[PDB]
Motif scaffolding. Structure first.
Motif, PDB file in Angstrom:
ATOM      1  N   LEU A  87       0.833  -1.195   0.000  1.00  0.00           N
ATOM      2  CA  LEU A  87       0.000   0.000   0.000  1.00  0.00           C
ATOM      3  C   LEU A  87       0.870   1.249   0.000  1.00  0.00           C
ATOM      4  N   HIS A  88       1.944   1.214   0.784  1.00  0.00           N
ATOM      5  CA  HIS A  88       2.874   2.332   0.850  1.00  0.00           C
ATOM      6  C   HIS A  88       3.527   2.553  -0.508  1.00  0.00           C
ATOM      7  N   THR A  89       3.878   1.457  -1.171  1.00  0.00           N
ATOM      8  CA  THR A  89       4.476   1.522  -2.497  1.00  0.00           C
ATOM      9  C   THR A  89       3.505   2.134  -3.501  1.00  0.00           C
ATOM     10  N   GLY A  90       2.235   1.763  -3.385  1.00  0.00           N
ATOM     11  CA  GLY A  90       1.211   2.238  -4.297  1.00  0.00           C
ATOM     12  C   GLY A  90       0.921   3.720  -4.164  1.00  0.00           C
ATOM     13  N   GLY A  91       1.671   4.398  -3.301  1.00  0.00           N
ATOM     14  CA  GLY A  91       1.484   5.820  -3.096  1.00  0.00           C
ATOM     15  C   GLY A  91       2.630   6.606  -3.701  1.00  0.00           C
ATOM     16  N   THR A  92       3.844   6.092  -3.531  1.00  0.00           N
ATOM     17  CA  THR A  92       5.027   6.728  -4.094  1.00  0.00           C
ATOM     18  C   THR A  92       4.938   6.743  -5.615  1.00  0.00           C
ATOM     19  N   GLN A  93       4.461   5.641  -6.182  1.00  0.00           N
ATOM     20  CA  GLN A  93       4.289   5.534  -7.625  1.00  0.00           C
ATOM     21  C   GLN A  93       3.268   6.551  -8.120  1.00  0.00           C
ATOM     22  N   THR A  94       2.196   6.725  -7.354  1.00  0.00           N
ATOM     23  CA  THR A  94       1.141   7.666  -7.712  1.00  0.00           C
ATOM     24  C   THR A  94      -0.110   7.437  -6.871  1.00  0.00           C
ATOM     25  N   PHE A  95       1.322  10.025  -9.934  1.00  0.00           N
ATOM     26  CA  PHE A  95       0.242  10.950  -9.670  1.00  0.00           C
ATOM     27  C   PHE A  95       0.076  11.095  -8.175  1.00  0.00           C
ATOM     28  N   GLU A  96       0.360  12.295  -7.647  1.00  0.00           N
ATOM     29  CA  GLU A  96       0.181  12.673  -6.258  1.00  0.00           C
ATOM     30  C   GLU A  96      -1.258  12.589  -5.775  1.00  0.00           C
ATOM     31  N   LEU A  97      -2.225  12.854  -6.679  1.00  0.00           N
ATOM     32  CA  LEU A  97      -3.631  12.578  -6.443  1.00  0.00           C
ATOM     33  C   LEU A  97      -3.932  11.105  -6.176  1.00  0.00           C
TER      34      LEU A  97
END
Lengths: 131, 532, 289, 307
Positions: free
Chosen positions: B173-183
């Motif tokens: 889940l943490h990884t899926g945030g760094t990758q993305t689009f900041e939105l």
């Protein structure tokens, strides 16, 4: 100009050049027939410019404490710089009498004569560019 | 009572105290002499390496930027500045490595390394100054440079580049945030938080993996604010634009958790640079290094700042301060002159070197200074005088620079004292010169008319006190010759006799008469030649 | 080329009798180290004469006419204090060379004083009061000597016979430079070349006349030093007084091909470093590349 | 190895003055025991005395060193009403060694009718020139007109002052850039002096006002890289004055600072070689070092103490 461009001569030429443009503008505003034939025939006989080019080249060729003297020239002083230089030379000789007084005197005459000659030479170039 | 006297070397000054010779049957009790000088600021063997390294770095900085400017404007300048900063960082790393040098039992290094680190922080600030995303990346790099502890170790390294399964899911889940689009990251964090809520040491680890993003602040509270900021740059959003909140966190987190160093860091964050300079002054070191940094800032002062123009003035002050700091290390003095490039500091420290004075080495240094000059004449004359005071070679050098009259007097005295005397100057191709020429003519006569003629011309130009001996030699030459054409000499001889009479009036006598009689014979011979 | 700068404006270093040592002026403790470093020794008194007289034995003449000798037993890392002398020259010797059974030395004022091996007794002395700084010194056909004063004054002298006169004299037409460089050939004990102050390339034929066989100016400032190859006579390279060694490729070139752009250099022996006028800090380690 | 420690002067009576040579390697001392001692700073760092001799019949107040171009010359000043010039002598036979050094008298100046307080060599550019001031209150300047004859000391000038305390301090400014002038501080109003164009006489350009107590000491600071000149007085207060010539009259003074943190007599004021640092000492037994601010105000850098 083929060998020399005098200060006064560069100023004279410039004045003549200035006089020509106003007349040309006046001719342009309204039209005169004798005047148009004279201008058109005159433009058909660049040669003057070519002649001036040689003079410019000659001037460039002519242009082609030593450091202190160079600084004094950049600042410009014969009456102010020249005398200063003479006095400084005297003070530089102050420490040492030198081997021959007569020879030293001759050198001094030779250095101050040449110095001012060269400075006047440099001074022209400014007039030649202005012309 | 205090009497203070400046010595001729800056690191050697004296203070003494005057008291009464005797008072109330009691003699003086203050005979102590206090050696006041430079003291603490420059010291140590390894210190020398570090100081030397710093000097070398300064020299390199002087060498590169000016050359680049000669090249003229380019981005290269933008990158060239970055390269210098990298070099400074490398130097700091070398300094950190040197601390390694200290050995048991007991050592000093933390101050040495801690002092060095401050320099590193400044370099980082310069790099930051060298868009928001880039700044965030720089912050992340800084952070990288900088059970639950095990979990932190697992994270910390990552950030700088059933329960277990849940933890893995949280990591995903943490990884899926760094990758993305900041939105997409904003929505990714929310979902992870929802999952954590649904979940309601392994559990704690899973919560950390969920992040988003509360714990990091708690970790900072347990600690450090800078570390927390680095973590934020690394895993939340890698833009670093607003530091009010971060500042509060460091300020409050730090308080929850050297103080002077923290204050200096805060001043740097404010961006200084005057405050930073004040902090450096309070530390008092490094002084020269700080001045160099100020000079670098002045060089950088790219962005259209009036303060920077004032900034330029401040930088100019710093070089003067560095010059004031320099004391007696010759290479360092040369470096200072280079930094200055005027003749003020020049002749000043030149004469300071004069004080210092190894004489041959000093002469070589003077020659190097002359080469650099390519005022100066006066300094050269002073150096010549000093060398003469310190012998024959030095006198010859002084003569070449031009004392010469004194040398002529000495050489002439020496050539009179011994007939078999040999002079180096005479062998080599004013009044002294004329005397030397006369001596050469005499030597030619000894060898066995052109020489004798030259000797007499040398005499007519000038005269010598033994002078009588020279006259006798001339008479001997005439006898060898037979004095056919002297004619003038007999007239010349009479004038010499008159001069001798004048000298007598102003002030072996039988012997002196005999010489005159001998001279008369030459005149008679000349008269005979005229008759012929 | 590795430049292990070690923060000492080094006056001297030389090839091992990789292997090496170094010596430096310009400090309180007169600085000299062996070698990655073997024997970093302190002494009072400068380094004017320098020759590691064995793998142990090592001699050194110092500034006050002093001459210190010791023995670098690198096995026990101990230096046997071999020899001491107070007033040789009290100037230093202004060059140093070697002679058979004695050092081919000379000094500025010119006190040609012959300490020799086991001659703690300084027996021989040509005490000719050399006026200019005699900084040119070599054995030519020992004891054929030639004191060269700071008028570049290469007077050929003798030490095996007696009498303080010099045997001959070599000189340029003018006498412009002071003594810094000469060149006794390994190809022949008679062939020499005057390296002088203009980047000045002069050549001195002993056996074939004595004219200026060369006069060629290439480097900037005064005569620094060179490094000949210790078995390749032709290959060398020339500097000037800032330190900038141009690759004076007389084996075959000369260019900007040193690790240059520094201050001055220390002393010469290569099989590697040279010596410029101000004797400053530099290093190299790959001297066959 | 190097150590700085307290050292005994070797003077029976009280030491009036200490002076450094040009290099700062040598020190001269004088005392009321009538002897002048010269110290060598060995390359091994300990001051060792080079020589001591009986200079005068009466106490020796002041001493000074000439510029090293002239040679090794020390001038001394006494209550016997004389000034003496000494030249260091070393003799070596045109052979190694054989050199012997001992103090010698070049000349005596008898002209001062009363006990002399001070003697100072002028700047090197001027030539061998010195000034002296006495209880007669007449400043006298002596020149050596021939550098070769170190015994040939002529009396260049005589001017009148007032009566009591005295100190002198030449402008060390190199000449070519600046004109010669000298400050005299006696007792209380003190008036300095300058030199005229070709009158070749000293004139009173101006005075330093606001002096408090007796004037224990005065020194002119090296004006290296500064147009203006600075003089500091140790009264029983420290003062710094800024002189500026501008262009009949061509002088102005400002008073830069006053400093009483000694709380007592300031006996000695001294300047740095560059003129960067000022020092002051006093009855507190404290020595203060001073720096100039960017504002040109002075600040105390730090204080050395002793007891």
């Amino acid at each position: 100009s083929v060998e020399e461009s005098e200060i006064s001569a560069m100023n004279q030429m410039s004045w003549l050049m200035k006089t020509a443009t106003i007349e040309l503008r006046i001719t342009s505003l309204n039209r005169q027939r004798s005047h148009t034939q004279r201008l058109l025939h005159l433009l058909l006989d660049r040669k003057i410019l070519r002649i001036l080019d040689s003079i410019q080249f000659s001037n460039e060729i002519p242009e082609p404490v030593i450091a202190n003297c160079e600084h004094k020239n950049r600042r410009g002083n014969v009456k102010l710089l020249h005398r200063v230089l003479v006095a400084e030379v005297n003070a530089l000789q102050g420490m040492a009498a030198i081997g021959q007084r007569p020879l030293l005197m001759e050198e001094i005459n030779t250095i101050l004569q040449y110095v001012v000659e060269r400075n006047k030479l440099l001074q022209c170039l400014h007039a030649k560019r202005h012309a | 009572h205090i009497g203070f006297s400046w010595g001729p070397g800056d690191l050697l000054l004296y203070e003494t105290l005057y008291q009464k010779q005797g008072n109330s049957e009691t003699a003086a009790r203050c005979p102590f002499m206090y050696l006041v000088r430079s003291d603490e600021d420059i010291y140590s063997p390894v210190l020398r390496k570090l100081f030397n390294e710093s000097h070398s770095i300064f020299v390199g900085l002087q060498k590169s930027a000016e050359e680049a400017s000669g090249k003229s404007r380019k981005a290269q300048l933008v990158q060239v500045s970055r390269n210098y900063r990298s070099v400074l960082r490398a130097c700091m790393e070398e300094m950190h490595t040197l601390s390694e040098s200290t050995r048991e039992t007991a050592q000093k290094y933390i101050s040495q390394i801690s002092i060095l680190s401050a320099m590193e922080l400044s370099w980082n600030l310069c790099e930051i100054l060298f868009p928001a995303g880039p700044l965030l990346i720089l912050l992340l790099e800084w952070v990288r440079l900088h059970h639950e502890k095990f979990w932190d170790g697992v994270t910390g390294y990552v950030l700088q580049g059933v329960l277990d399964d849940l933890l893995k899911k949280m990591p995903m889940l943490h990884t899926g945030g760094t990758q993305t689009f900041e939105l997409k990251w904003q929505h990714w964090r929310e979902e992870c938080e929802r999952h954590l809520q649904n979940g309601t040491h392994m559990e704690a680890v899973c919560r950390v993996l969920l992040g988003d993003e509360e714990v990091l602040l708690e970790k900072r509270d347990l600690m450090t604010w800078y570390h927390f900021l680095v973590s934020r740059l690394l895993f939340k959003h890698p833009t670093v634009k607003p530091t009010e909140l971060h500042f509060y966190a460091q300020s409050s987190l730090d308080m929850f958790l050297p103080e002077p160093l923290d204050n200096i860091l805060l001043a740097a964050f404010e961006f200084d640079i005057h405050q930073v300079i004040k902090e450096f002054s309070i530390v008092s070191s490094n002084w020269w290094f700080v001045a160099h940094l100020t000079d670098l800032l002045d060089h950088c002062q790219l962005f259209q700042a009036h303060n920077l123009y004032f900034g330029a003035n401040m930088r100019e002050f710093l070089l003067l301060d560095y010059a004031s700091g320099l004391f007696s290390h010759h290479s360092l003095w040369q470096l200072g002159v280079d930094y200055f490039d005027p003749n003020l500091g020049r002749e000043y420290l030149k004469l300071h070197m004069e004080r210092i004075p190894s004489t041959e080495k000093k002469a070589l240094k003077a020659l190097r200074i002359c080469e650099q000059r390519q005022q100066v004449r006066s300094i050269c004359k002073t150096m010549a005088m000093q060398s003469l005071c310190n012998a024959l070679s030095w006198s010859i050098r002084a003569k070449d620079a031009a004392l010469i009259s004194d040398r002529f007097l000495k050489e002439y005295c020496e050539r009179g004292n011994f007939t078999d005397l040999d002079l180096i100057d005479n062998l080599g191709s004013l009044s002294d010169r004329l005397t030397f020429l006369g001596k050469y003519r005499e030597f030619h006569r000894m060898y066995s008319f052109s020489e004798a003629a030259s000797l007499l011309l040398s005499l007519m130009t000038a005269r010598i006190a033994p002078c009588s001996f020279w006259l006798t030699l001339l008479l001997d030459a005439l006898p060898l010759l037979e004095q056919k054409q002297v004619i003038f000499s007999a007239e010349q001889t009479y004038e010499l006799m008159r001069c001798l009479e004048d000298r007598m009036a102003a002030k072996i006598q039988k012997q002196d008469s005999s010489i005159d009689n001998t001279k008369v014979e030459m005149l008679r011979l000349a008269l005979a030649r005229n008759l012929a | 080329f590795a430049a292990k700068f070690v923060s000492h404006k080094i006056s001297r270093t030389r090839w091992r009798p990789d292997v090496f040592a170094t010596g430096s002026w310009d400090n309180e403790e007169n600085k000299v180290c062996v070698w990655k470093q073997l024997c970093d020794i302190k002494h009072p008194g400068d380094v004017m004469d320098m020759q590691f007289l064995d793998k142990e034995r090592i001699v050194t003449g110092s500034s006050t006419g002093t001459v210190t000798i010791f023995r670098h037993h690198e096995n026990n890392q101990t230096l046997s204090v071999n020899q001491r002398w107070e007033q040789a020259h009290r100037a230093p010797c202004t060059a140093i060379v070697c002679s058979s059974p004695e050092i081919v030395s000379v000094g500025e004022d010119g006190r040609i004083n012959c300490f020799r091996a086991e001659s703690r007794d300084v027996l021989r002395t040509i005490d000719d009061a050399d006026s200019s700084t005699m900084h040119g010194v070599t054995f030519l056909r020992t004891t054929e000597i030639l004191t060269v004063n700071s008028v570049g004054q290469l007077k050929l002298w003798d030490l095996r016979k007696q009498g303080n006169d010099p045997t001959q004299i070599f000189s340029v037409t003018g006498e412009r430079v002071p003594l810094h460089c000469v060149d006794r050939h390994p190809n022949q004990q008679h062939v020499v070349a005057t390296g002088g102050q203009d980047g000045m390339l002069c050549i001195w034929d002993v056996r074939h006349g004595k004219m200026p066989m060369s006069l060629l100016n290439a480097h900037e400032a005064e005569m620094w030093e060179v490094h000949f190859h210790p078995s390749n006579p032709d290959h060398l390279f020339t500097c000037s007084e800032d330190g900038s060694l141009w690759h004076w490729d007389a084996s075959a070139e000369i260019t900007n091909l040193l690790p240059s752009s520094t201050l001055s250099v220390n002393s010469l022996d290569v099989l590697l470093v040279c010596g410029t006028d101000a004797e400053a800090i530099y290093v190299t380690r790959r001297l066959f590349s | 190895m190097f150590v700085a420690r307290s050292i005994a002067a070797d003077h029976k009576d009280l030491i009036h003055d200490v002076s450094f040579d040009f290099h700062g390697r040598r020190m001269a001392t004088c005392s009321s025991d009538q002897s002048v001692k010269v110290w060598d700073k060995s390359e091994n760092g300990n001051w060792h005395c080079t020589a001591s001799w009986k200079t005068h019949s009466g106490s020796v107040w002041r001493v000074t060193w000439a510029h090293p171009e002239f040679g090794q010359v020390l001038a001394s000043c006494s209550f016997d009403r004389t000034a003496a010039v000494w030249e260091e002598i070393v003799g070596e036979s045109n052979d190694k060694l054989r050199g012997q050094s001992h103090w010698v008298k070049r000349t005596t100046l008898v002209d001062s009718r009363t006990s002399v307080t001070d003697v100072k060599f002028a700047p090197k550019h001027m030539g061998l020139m010195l000034a002296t001031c006495s209880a007669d209150g007449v400043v006298r300047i002596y020149e050596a007109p021939d550098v070769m004859n170190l015994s040939q000391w002529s009396l260049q000038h005589e001017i009148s002052c007032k009566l009591s305390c005295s100190c002198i301090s030449w402008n060390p400014s190199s000449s070519r850039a600046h004109s010669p002038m000298i400050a005299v501080g006696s007792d209380g109003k003190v008036q300095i002096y300058e030199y005229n164009e070709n009158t070749r006489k000293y004139a009173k350009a101006e005075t330093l006002m606001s002096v408090s107590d007796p004037v224990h000491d005065i020194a002119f600071a090296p004006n290296l890289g500064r147009s203006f000149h600075i003089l500091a007085v140790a009264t029983k207060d420290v003062r710094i004055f800024t002189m500026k010539p501008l262009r009949v009259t061509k002088f102005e003074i400002h008073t830069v600072a006053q400093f009483d943190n000694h709380n007592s007599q300031v006996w000695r004021v001294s300047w740095n070689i560059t003129g960067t640092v000022l020092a002051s000492s006093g009855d507190d037994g404290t020595v203060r070092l001073w720096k100039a601010n960017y504002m040109d105000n002075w600040k105390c850098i730090g204080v050395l103490k002793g007891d």
